[PDB]
């Protein structure tokens, strides 16, 4: 219903879960604030810096055609029909965020040779190039995440664990990979529970007692969506049930997962893909205003939900995102590098196909998608923009078009509670014991 | 590359694995005779009789747009694009065969509200109408088949078994459903192996070796693709490894799965969905020759493969199917049943939308798929066409567009060479098997 359009010489398709998935009947629920709106603004911020970059396509302005997935694969696939209908013209696609939506969207995109780079889809399956030949990502596959989690249990001598998976490609294949890896380290799994898309608080108590039916297994491994980890922790709190949580990037270092069930979560070890905040995105997001951000068609709806106001009611104007603490979303960097990977690919494309000018020559009217994905997108290699220069971070894709298997490890501890970085994984597990009380 | 097109007032899409899958450079392999050609020819047969029928769509003609899936989802989806290029116009789609083919095709077909009826896709994944709101099938979900297979093990007190599943939505869900039914009947799994999309003869051996790592687990439960079962039977014969096979409809009673691996498979228990060879299909298929069947662009290739001749070298001419021992592929009836399910739904929709004529009126141009599926496809009830005398079977779909969980159980034995399938029993809301018919 709402289209996000930016004019430009070339148009970059975008796909973001602006809204949450709806209730039993509605396809779209409330605005997904952090992983939705903020990740969308990250693509818009990147496109602005690129359009100001004199070293990166100074003669070709990049546009955007950003669609909302509503956190549901079938809705994203109904929306992704815009990207194919013409064949405005869509050069590539940034997104989606959730694996299921990327799989579904990739199967349609390959039929029209549309390149796609995801900034958050981690499911290992997307690494298979015979089925997903137009798919690249700035994120590593979950082969490497599940391997890393198996080493955490191997290190802390945890050999009788349990597993919790969100239904879908991410949770199932993620736990499946974890099965192989725990097996390979003498770790035996007591039981394996699966969480339905939209369970009730009664259903999660079912899962708690299901995990409890083996009291000896006090450790639980999770390949879960954040809502699921939060409802399961809430259910654990209500049922006065104490588990040792070992969780994937779904939970990550999200305050919203543990908020209200901080006691039930204390002791937990979580994983986030290795990222850093970008300060120029921070000041850009906090200076965003509903009367100046008309280019984002969902920014007013976010503003009404963020501040409990209405533009009809005239009570939105006194608020600012600067009064608020800015908790920059974890995968913001990966959105930023994914837009840059596509822009560099196209800069390299233009350099070779239009040597005589900075403008778009007939050799890129239209842009050959196959040549773009195979010869340029896959062969990008540049410094991550805005990177913490003290550490050398580089943007490229391996033989399977995946990002680098590097993860940060955290712990939820204690009045007051907080996630603390305790280690990392980058080919090997590396963590210091001095940062854990147990 | 080829597309079987025929004129009609309404056009029904078709999807069959006319060709097996190829290698890395090719997307299409040799001709698939049984699950390809006979299945394609069954739809043409049904179309031909529907168009002669004075009681079923007398004034409305049915055309077709039959595509080749090449036993591969990505190729099928490239092809299925034809069905949605109107936005010739496609009213409904008959197909595909492979469950991963039918899933991919449905995700697209629902976008343009096009009803889909599969004659072979058994994945339980396809029973969920939130996700597959325009899909229906003349076959049951694998929820019942997995229940059927654990009942067979529980009956023979095989408490320690191994599993093998073809990667994808048929193998993985089938076996997972099976393993839960096995657990609940105290049947423990020793090991579980996966058969990938691009398997090598060495990789197939690695699967056999993994199965032998548990020497007590002599039972091997498979939810595999046809080709995946044959190659596992080939790898086991190469290794003189002996397993009791219990296998899903993928294997079924296919002679092509056991060819060259007759001793490796002896004593195998195989499942097929309960069906009957249909009456007039044998006359039709056997009366097919290459100088009349120009309407099937893959038929000449089937002819060459069948008789090991060449039209370019003119050896083929002196041949006819009316001398061969006609083996009617087990799902022929479900293909014919799907074609007739769509025909009846449209006949009934036409009664509702065009009451003053036999011809396709404007209230039905184009056919509204949402109304066709929900108000007419899901509600169809009719006597199964071409049903043999002693049979009184009815074609219908349940609340979730599913067929009924009915299956025949067979066993593979050496009688007089001369190896064959023998029906030992059936499954229909409980197990019934004749222990007297199994040699072992
Ligand atoms: N890595 C994810 C995926 O779907 O592939 C798992 C997740 C569901 C929890 C979403 C995370 C995110 O948006 O930060 C993606
Ligand atoms: N029932 C099937 C399915 O895909 O759901 C299993 C199979 C893969 C082996 C193919 C069989 C067939 O075409 O008769 C279908």
Looking up residue A213, the CATH number of its domain turns out to be 3.40.50.2300
Determine, for residues B78 and A108 on separate chains, whether the beta-carbon distance falls below 8 Å. Answer: no
Yes or no: say if A330 and A253 are a contact pair by the CB < 8 Å rule: yes
Q: Can you read off the two tokens belonging to residue A320?
A: 């600012």
A268 & A312 share domain: no
Q: Which two tokens stand for residue B202?
A: 């060495």
If one residue of B170, B229, B257 were mutated to test the ligand 2 pocket, choosing by the most ligand atoms within 8 A of its CB, it would be: B170
Please give the tally of structural domains in chain A.
Answer: 2
SS3 B157: coil
Compute the distance from residue B257 Cα to the ligand 2 centre, in Å.
13
Residue B367 distance to chain A (closest CA, Å): 21
Interchain CB distance below 8 Å, A77 and B111: yes
Q: Is A96 in the pocket of ligand 1 (CB under 6 A)?
A: no
Q: Do B409 and B261 sit in the same domain of this protein?
A: yes
Contacting A with CB below 8 Å, chain B residues are 73-74, 77-78, 81, 104, 107-108, 110-111, 131, 197-198
Task: Compare CB distances from A111 to B78, B131, B198 and report the shortest one's residue.
Answer: B78
Q: What angle do CA B69, B119, B82 make, to 5 degrees?
A: 35
Regarding whether A357 and A214 lie in a shared domain, the answer is no
Q: Residue A128's closest chain B neighbor by CA? A: B197
Q: Are A15 and A163 in the same domain?
A: no
- Cβ of A280: how many Cβ atoms within 10 Å? 12
What are residue B395's phi and psi, to 5 degrees?
-95, 125
Q: Which atom of ligand 2 is nearest to the CA of B331?
A: 14
Kindly state the tokens that stand for B357.
């004529």
A118 lines ligand 1 (CB under 6 A): no
Q: Are B407 and B330 in contact (CB under 8 A)?
A: no
Deposited experimental method: X-ray
Q: How far is the CA of A97 from the centre of ligand 1 (A)?
A: 6
> Same structural domain for residues A170 and A257?
yes
Q: Whose CA is nearest to atom 15 of ligand 1?
A: A98
**CA B53 to CA B70: how far, in whole Å?**
32
Inter-residue contact B6 to B47 (CB < 8 Å): yes
Q: Do B197 and A130 touch (CB under 8 A)?
A: yes
Are residue A329 and residue A202 in the same domain, yes or no?
no
User: Which ligand lies nearest the alpha carbon of B141?
Assistant: 2
Nearest CA to ligand 1 atom 9: A250
| Structural contact between residues A179 and A189, judged by C-beta atoms closer than 8 angstroms | yes
Cis ω for the linkage preceding A416 (within 30 of 0): yes
Q: Can you tell me the distance from the alpha carbon of B44 to that of A259, in angstroms, rounded to the nearest whole number?
A: 62
- Tell whether B410 and B269 lie within a shared domain: yes
Taking the C-alpha atoms of B199, B201, B205 and B210 in order, what is their torsion angle to the nearest 10 degrees?
A: -10
- Cβ neighbours around A85 below 10 Å, total: 11
Contacts of B197 in chain A (CB under 8 A): 130-131
Tokens linked to A282: 């921070």
Among A81, A104, A131, select the one facing B74 at the smallest CB separation.
A131
Question: How far, CA to CA in Å, does A227 sit from each of A100, A252, A255, A259, A407?
Answer: 16, 12, 12, 12, 22
Closest-approach residue (CA) in chain A for B111: A78
Of all helices (H) and strands (E), which one includes residue A212? helix A201-212
Whether residue A79 sits in one domain with residue A36: yes
Question: Is B107 in contact with A74 (Cβ distance < 8 A)?
Answer: yes
Identify the three-state secondary structure at position A122: coil
Beta strands in A4-143 (DSSP E): 4-6, 10-16, 19-21, 28-31, 62-68, 93-94, 116-118, 135-137
Ligand 2 binding pocket (C-beta < 6 A) is B 35, 97-99, 120-123, 170, 225-226, 249-250, 331
Residue pair A328/A277 in contact (Cβ under 8 Å)? The answer is: yes
Contact assessment for residue B167 and residue B195, using Cβ atoms and an 8 Å cutoff: yes
Give the position, in ligand 1's atom list, of the atom nearest the Cα of A250.
Answer: 9
Residue A122 assigned ligand-binding role: yes
SS3 state at B251: coil
Shared domain check, A267 and A170? yes
Whether residue A305 sits in one domain with residue A194: no
Written as one string, the DSSP assignment of B77-130 is: HHHHGGGGTT----SEEE--SSHHHHHHHHHHHGGGT--EEESS---GGGG-TT
Residues A14 and A55 in one domain: yes
- Cα A120 from Cα A122, distance rounded (Å): 6
Regarding whether A313 and A264 lie in a shared domain, the answer is no
Out of B81, B131, B198, name the one closest to residue A111 (CB): B81
DSSP class of residue B24? S
Which domain, by its residues, includes A24? 1-140+275-404
CB contact under 8 A, B107 and A104: yes
- Whether residue B77 and residue A107 make contact (CB cut-off 8 A), yes or no, is yes
């Amino acid at each position: 219903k709402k289209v996000l359009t930016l004019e430009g010489d070339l148009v970059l398709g975008g796909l973001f879960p602006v809204h949450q998935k709806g209730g039993p009947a509605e396809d779209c629920g409330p605005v997904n604030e952090h992983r939705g709106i903020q990740r969308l603004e990250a693509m818009l911020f990147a496109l602005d810096r690129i359009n100001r970059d004199p070293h990166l396509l100074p003669g070709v302005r990049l546009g955007a055609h950003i669609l909302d997935s509503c956190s549901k694969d079938t809705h994203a696939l109904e929306q992704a029909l815009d990207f194919v209908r013409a064949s405005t013209a869509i050069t590539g696609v940034i997104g989606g965020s959730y694996s299921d939506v990327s799989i579904q969207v990739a199967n349609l995109l390959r039929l029209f040779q549309i390149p796609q780079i995801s900034y958050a889809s981690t499911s290992a399956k997307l690494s298979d190039k015979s089925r997903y030949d137009y798919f690249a990502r700035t994120v590593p596959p979950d082969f490497f995440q599940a391997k890393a989690m198996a080493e955490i249990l191997r290190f802390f001598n945890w050999t009788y664990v349990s597993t919790v998976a969100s239904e879908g490609d991410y949770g199932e294949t993620g736990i499946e990979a974890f099965e192989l890896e725990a097996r390979a380290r003498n770790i035996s799994v007591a039981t394996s529970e699966k969480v339905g898309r939209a369970m009730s608080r009664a259903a999660f108590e079912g899962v708690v007692r299901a995990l409890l039916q083996k009291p000896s297994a006090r450790v639980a491994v999770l390949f879960t969506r954040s809502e699921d980890a939060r409802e399961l922790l809430a259910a654990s709190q209500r049922l006065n049930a104490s588990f040792t949580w070992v969780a994937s990037d779904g939970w990550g270092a999200l305050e919203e997962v543990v908020a209200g069930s901080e006691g039930a979560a204390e002791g937990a070890i979580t994983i986030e893909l290795a990222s850093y905040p970008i300060s120029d995105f921070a000041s850009y997001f906090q200076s965003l205003d509903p009367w100046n951000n008309s280019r984002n068609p969902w920014f007013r709806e976010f503003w009404e939900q963020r501040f409990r106001c209405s533009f009809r009611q005239r009570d939105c104007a006194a608020h600012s995102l600067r009064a608020v603490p800015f908790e920059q979303e974890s995968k913001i960097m990966f959105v930023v590098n994914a837009v840059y990977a596509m822009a560099h690919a196209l800069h390299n494309m233009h350099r070779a196909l239009c040597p005589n000018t900075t403008r778009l020559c007939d050799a890129m009217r239209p842009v050959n998608g196959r040549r773009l994905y195979k010869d340029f997108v896959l062969n990008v290699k540049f410094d991550a923009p805005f990177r913490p220069a003290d550490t050398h971070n580089e943007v490229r894709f391996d033989r399977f078009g995946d990002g680098i298997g590097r993860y940060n490890i955290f712990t939820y501890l204690r009045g007051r509670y907080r996630y603390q970085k305790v280690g990392y994984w980058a080919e090997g597990l590396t963590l210091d014991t001095s940062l854990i009380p147990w």
